[PDB]
Amino acid sequence: LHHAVIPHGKGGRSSVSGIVATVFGATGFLGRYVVNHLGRMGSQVIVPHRCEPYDTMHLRPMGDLGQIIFMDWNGRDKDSIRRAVEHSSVVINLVGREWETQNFDFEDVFVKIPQAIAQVSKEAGVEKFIHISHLNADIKSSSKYLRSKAVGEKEVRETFPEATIIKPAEIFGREDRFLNYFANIRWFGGVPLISLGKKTVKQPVYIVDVTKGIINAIKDPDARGKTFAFVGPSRYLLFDLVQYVFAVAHRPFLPYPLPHFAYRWIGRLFEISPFEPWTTRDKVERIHTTDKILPHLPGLEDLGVEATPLELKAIEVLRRHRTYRWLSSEIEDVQPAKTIPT
Amino acid sequence: ILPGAAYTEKSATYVNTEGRAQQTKVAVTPPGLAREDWKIIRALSEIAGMTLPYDTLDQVRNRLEEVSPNLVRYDDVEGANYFQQASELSKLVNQQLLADPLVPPQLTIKDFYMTDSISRASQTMAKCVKAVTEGAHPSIC
Amino acid sequence: GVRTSPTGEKVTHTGQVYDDGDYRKVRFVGRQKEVNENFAIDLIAEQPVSQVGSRVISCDGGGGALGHPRVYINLDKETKTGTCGYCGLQFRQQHH
Amino acid sequence: KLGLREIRIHLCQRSPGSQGVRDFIEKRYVELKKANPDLPILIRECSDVQPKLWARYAFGQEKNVSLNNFSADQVTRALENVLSSKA
Amino acid sequence: STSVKPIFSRDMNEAKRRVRELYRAWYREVPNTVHLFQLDISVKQGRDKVREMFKKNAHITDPRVVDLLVIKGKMELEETIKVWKQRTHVMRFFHETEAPRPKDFLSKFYVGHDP
Amino acid sequence: DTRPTVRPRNDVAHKQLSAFGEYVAEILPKYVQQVQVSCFNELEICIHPDGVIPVLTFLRDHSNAQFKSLADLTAVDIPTRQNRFEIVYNLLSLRFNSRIRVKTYTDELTPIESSVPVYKAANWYEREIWDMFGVFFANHPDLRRILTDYGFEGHPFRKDFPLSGYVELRYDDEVKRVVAEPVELAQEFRKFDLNSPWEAFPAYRQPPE
Amino acid sequence: TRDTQLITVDEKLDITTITGVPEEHIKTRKARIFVPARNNMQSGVNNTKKWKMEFDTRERWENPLMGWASTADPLSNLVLTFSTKEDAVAFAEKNGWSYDVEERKVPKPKSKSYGANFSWNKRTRVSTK
């Protein structure tokens, strides 16, 4: 934090925030909001990308001249990771996938890449490390996604002890895979649900809430070495959450129960797609997994962020799924879902 | 160490040798994390639970008017009187003058170029002192 | 000529070089730092001092109207060469 | 401690409303300083200022008493109300 | 010295009649603005923003200044009704992309030199 | 008058415009406050703002004036005056092949009578004056902003308005919208002090103090 | 007289609510009303004849890309010219700004005699010419 890393300005795009951040996986859902918030205050952002430069274009307006720097990196190349972090004061790890490719398994992107980044960051002298785990991560889950998340969350602690590990619940937003996933089930007629969605409880959180918590953790000096659980203000049943989704979108809602084994066989069929699968056996498990209640972990309120209710910010996500008949329906037209009081 | 502002980096009041109050004007802001001097104390008071009753420069100068009203009469010299009273009170105690002769601290010009933190940190005053002791032992444009 | 600090970054003719801990070096990762290798201070020093048999000489920079404003240079001082304030050429008086 | 720590007297050099304080200083200040050698008694004169008598007690507590149009004897009594009560 | 041509009102009683009339016009137009522009806010939020804007100028006592405020406010209503404004202009009253600036002395002291 | 680099002086026109200036003043003593002719033979009529319609109507309709074209209408902001604004009318006479200037004034709060009834051309010029200066015109068909952005606060051409304004626009990805935020400049506008400390034109010197 | 049917308004002129300026730039500012001092490098006095109104200087920092001087102060280049001090004070109070007024400094008249350069019994005799 020498002379060039002293804050200046009034928090604008042409200010100097003093933050030099390397955001891995910045081309995805949770990464476009983090870069947007960092560049709003005038931060130096390094964005190592694996994909075509055409797919990084939406990130370019997010910063003043020279503030967003793009590098090409490989998850299995330890030298590329070092080039992208050796000048940074904070490293943010957002790498993840909801499916498995021929080249990267769940444990390749949740156990190995997170550990490789953490090790190189410590060897490079990086001061802050922010790792995004999952709320429902544990070694004894039915999902490799969550099983691998728990392992990765442990390797990071052993490599970067001062890391700040954040464990969000399912995140809903515009470019999400949670509310859009449920709405797009309408193509298949009915909405299958394991146990008819009556035995699953979900506590979704808003993307801006997660984005403001990560930014606060960077600036807050007491977030080092502390594990946070970013969850929403209300707990819903999966049946009520999905029913509310179809109510906002004004689409017919025709649920029907489906045995857990049957929903896996269907998921196996969809996994054959050589592109982004519509659904996988892992997503079915994740969707039908009760969100853990971790009272021992600090939450968003401990970083100064007020959790946004789903109702206030669900129409902005689901207005796209309505027909011309129901595009203009107002926010106050759909009664709120039923919550699970403590 | 609490960094502060120099006279070129704050709006501050100085009283010259004749009792005339004058205020500097901000030319450049303090270099890094340095802050205006009276704000550091104001911030310190709030943290210590003894918040001072002024938040802005105009309010601090209202306080100066309470302690000594002449401190907010800029470019004005306020006449001071009662020389007779001072003479009387000075004769109550009779101290003796030391035999040592009066010798100013600055006998020659080489003692004039460095008398404070700013001048001792200057590379031009350092050249002046070297010039008036060692002498002048390439200008084109 | 072009030097290199311990970190290996070339020092410009204005003496500019990022320190070891300066994050701004990251702008050169995957790219290059543009440094002009023809240092003017070095090249002008290679020019020889011209001998002139007069107290006062004038320089217009060469080329007439394609040079610089015509200035006059005094050569009385024998302990140094007279230097043009525009182009840097040096002059001396023949055996004074 | 609740004792007195400082006295400040503000007055104008010409205004007729400050004549009492000037009369007080011309004749009585020398005595009031010798009786309180260790008490700072600040006498700050400006132009066109309403006379006042400030009294700073322990821990920053300050009280002021207007001396406008006071006579030379009320000013003497005003100070005694400050150097004696020690509130 | 005090004689001046009025704009519309001759006294505050006449000027406050136009202010209340303008508030009614804005109050009735928020439900349509939230509908036509497809704003992701509720009517309660929009009508509370209208009330906030009126309250900012509640300390005025000059009938000529109040008339300009009503004239300016009436122009804002005309643009909203006729959809000359876009969603960006309507939502500029809410400052959703600006981080809340500090208000207390200590918070301002840490981050910069501004009062 | 043979000097190549000095503009020739036309004294015939100077005489004609001075005579017509008195002609106007004699006919409209109720409003005309001052009349002058510049060294380049341009006539200016300075009037009380209450005479905007009478003075313009006379110049448009009178047989010996016939100023039937409004070349331009504009305002000048001079903060040092009580009436900081100065409404300038430029009229063109096709019959007599001459031009005249009519000048009035107003402050931030005093309305000025609209000239639309006399010149339809003034409809858009008065919107510009209101938009860029904040001068209200009474009885205007539709008075709106014409040049600034929708919901723009402030009148840019006022001398106390900053050159770069108070807001700037950018696209924000979080809200999928174009947003407005306080102005910040990567390079501040550099202010140059160019005025020479030596008087240039003695003929325009003002009385001391 | 006028026939515009005037009205009587008795209250200090105030246009802070209709100028469109943000709140933070009406209350935290400080406008300095003064007559500019002579540029000591010259002898001309033509720049010291009009009053000016400049605001307090805010932070300028270094652009991380090119090292330029960045600012967040919209009124950093705002200088207004007035014919008289009362005109400047009136404008400042009309717009709600707080102002400090510096009274004009005029050089005092001086007695200059060329004959004193050669004095019989005074110290004004010059040793060189």
Ligand SMILES: NC(=O)C1=CN([C@@H]2O[C@H](COP(=O)(O)OP(=O)(O)OC[C@H]3O[C@@H](n4cnc5c(N)ncnc54)[C@H](OP(=O)(O)O)[C@@H]3O)[C@@H](O)[C@H]2O)C=CC1
């Ligand atoms: N429902 C949710 O969104 C939840 C998110 N999280 C976690 O947050 C992080 C981001 O989530 P989200 O933005 O929604 O998912 P996205 O798919 O939108 O983003 C994934 C990012 O990681 C990159 N990525 C994936 N695999 C690789 C790989 N082998 N090598 C290099 N980069 C790779 C991607 O690069 P590219 O696109 O160029 O291929 C992309 O930038 C993840 O760690 C996720 O587990 C945890 C709780 C809830």
Ligand SMILES: [Zn+2]
């Ligand atoms: Zn030369």
